[PDB]
């Protein structure tokens, strides 16, 4: 900074303290009362959601291994498993709605061979709606999946 008359060297250490500190101390996170910092990924107006968050782990899969001692990952507020579950609860109702039809179908049609035609009718009609809404742009949305069931 300076050199006063008697060649006494003034440095930046003398007039000010120098540590490697944060760029912004305005915000501070505590995972269950323990000091930490994470990542809050926000969606891109028209992004694929579940497919984007699958690739959040894909890119992050190769960062994991080169971490230093102690540095662990942990998952709060996560959308992923709710997608996983609504699919599993609807496809559950699908198979239930088949089996249950199959019993009313036997109760009336004592013929087992006849309790088979309608049983083996809607399996194909569902698949077609996957092939039709894929051909029209739609997804396996929360909506279209209740439309499979309904």
């Amino acid at each position: 900074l300076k050199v006063n008359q008697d060649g006494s060297r003034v440095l930046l250490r003398d007039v000010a303290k120098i540590e490697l500190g944060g760029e912004n101390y305005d915000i501070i996170a505590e995972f269950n009362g323990q000091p930490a910092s994470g990542l809050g990924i926000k969606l891109a107006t028209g992004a694929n959601a579940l497919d984007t968050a699958a690739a959040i782990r894909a890119e992050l899969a190769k960062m994991e291994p080169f971490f230093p001692s102690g540095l662990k990952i942990v998952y709060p507020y996560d959308t992923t498993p709710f997608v996983k579950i609504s699919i599993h609860e609807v496809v559950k109702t699908l198979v239930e709605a088949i089996i249950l039809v199959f019993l009313v179908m036997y109760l009336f049609l004592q013929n087992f061979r006849a309790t088979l035609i309608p049983t083996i009718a809607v399996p194909v009609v569902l698949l077609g709606t996957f092939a039709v809404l894929a051909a029209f742009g739609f997804s396996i949305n929360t909506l279209t999946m209740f439309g499979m069931v309904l």
């Binding site: 500190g21 944060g22 912004n24 101390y25 305005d26």
Partner: protein, 50 residues
């Protein structure tokens, strides 16, 4: 060039920080933003530039 420089100095808005700064000191109770220079408003205020 002096008139121009007088407006590029007096007629301006300056980024002054705040009390209870971004990294404050443990125990402070207040946090208020500092005001500094202001962009001038009226014709009268431009008449009084030194």
């Amino acid at each position: 060039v002096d008139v121009i420089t007088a407006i590029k100095a007096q007629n301006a808005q300056v980024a002054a920080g705040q009390l209870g700064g971004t990294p404050p000191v443990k125990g402070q109770q207040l946090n208020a933003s500092i005001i500094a220079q202001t962009r001038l408003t009226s014709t009268e205020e431009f008449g009084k530039i030194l």
